[PDB]
Symmetry: C2
Subunit: 256 residues, 2 copies
């Protein structure tokens, strides 16, 4: 079967991270939308204009709003994209056939929104040459960051080619986890986010979202289906593009 996939990048990243997977999915006959979230990729906004993970998700929310009644899509989020998925699901669960997590955070409904993010910081505390800054928006102090080039090279693009890593150095922008804002945000709902089908894709060779963290998330919030890709790195859409497309095809044939 064919499906309409909506690819969601992580903070500091942009739609460009999906430049290899998107054409492959289309070669399978699927419809693919790869969005730039607020202040990401070529979006015109700067991070200082964004005050929460929800505002950061605007482009995704607006896209879903534009979907005619009856049209469903399969969301695919990488790394922190899982949070965008949760936010979107509490607003448009009926338009989501399923959500696919790609080495991504997996929020739940029993703990506050920042729960898995706080856990991630515990498992991976050293972000190496990543730099941080602060700005104020809507009366709150937000911590912004810019992923370090060494961190990118060693933990994210571990096995990616130098041509792919180059795009990261040229295109990655300042972003934020809005961690303190997530902590005070209303919990994700059981009726919205809790009701959607969730497929968890990962590899134990991920050098940033370590096995301890990912296995911890799976035990914390049981996915409907779990796919483990052998080898590759954190950026499976670059190092295991073909494998990811095959998994997404199966998801398309399973959930609608």
């Amino acid at each position: 079967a064919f499906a309409h996939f909506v690819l969601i990048h992580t903070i500091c990243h942009g739609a460009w991270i999906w430049h290899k997977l998107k054409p492959l999915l289309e070669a399978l006959g699927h419809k693919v939308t790869a969005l730039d979230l607020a202040a990401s990729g070529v979006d015109p906004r700067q991070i200082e204009e964004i005050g929460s993970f929800d505002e950061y998700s605007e482009p995704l929310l607006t896209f879903l709003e534009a979907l005619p009644p009856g049209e469903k899509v399969i969301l695919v989020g990488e790394s922190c994209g899982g949070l965008n998925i949760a936010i979107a699901a509490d607003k448009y669960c009926e338009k989501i056939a399923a959500a696919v997590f790609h080495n991504s955070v997996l929020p739940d409904t029993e703990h506050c929104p920042s729960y898995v993010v706080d856990k991630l910081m515990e498992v991976f505390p050293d972000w190496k040459d990543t730099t941080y800054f602060t700005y104020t928006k809507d009366g709150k102090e937000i911590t912004g960051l810019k992923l370090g080039f060494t961190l990118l090279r060693e933990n994210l693009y571990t096995l990616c080619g130098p041509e792919e890593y180059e795009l990261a150095k040229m295109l990655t922008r300042k972003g934020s986890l809005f961690q303190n804002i997530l902590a005070k945000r209303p919990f994700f709902t059981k009726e919205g986010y809790g009701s959607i089908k969730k497929i968890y894709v990962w590899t134990d060779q991920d050098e940033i979202f370590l096995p301890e963290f990912q296995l911890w998330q799976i035990e914390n919030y049981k996915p409907d289906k779990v796919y483990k890709v052998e080898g590759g790195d954190h950026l499976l859409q670059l190092t295991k593009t073909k494998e990811i497309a095959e998994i997404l095809q199966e998801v398309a044939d399973t959930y609608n």
Copy 2:
């Protein structure tokens, strides 16, 4: 020998177009700077804020200004990047060891700045699905454009892979040729731009900067050296990356 190359993208493009060539040049021991011009790539400005090709060149001019006395670089421009080179040379000729034109416009000093651009429009009048718009800046009506996806696919990324073409669809932004502004701009000088060494690189398989146009430019303003690459397409830094690096190495060993 080693040199410091400054790669300059064309309008509607960004530094990302050099993601393959930059690491290759560095693997040869060179220092490489790939800039995002105004309102291009991840530059924060929008095209409506730019009123001339000179303002558009700001990032290049600012970069050259920051070069300590005695430090020279080799400029490499693609397509319309040749105009940025001419503008930069009339301000920092002493900091330019040489300029390399990569399937690029080659301005002269005998005709107005828009001369070769006007000729290009005559040789390649149909830009297919490219769209146009107008905005006003500093009392002038400027024609902006957004390269059509079909034009990109068929004439620019002719022989490039679908993964490279995807980046173009995801990253290309609105831009402008500032043609009417160039027409009224003071002529490029013989003492500045006219004095720098110019190396012309091209391929007769270019589907947008056609052989008629490029051979016309070579006859119009005789380059110090001409390199013709067999095969490939308009984007030789993607389809003939290795060949381009070898040519640039020879340039580095020739001009300093």
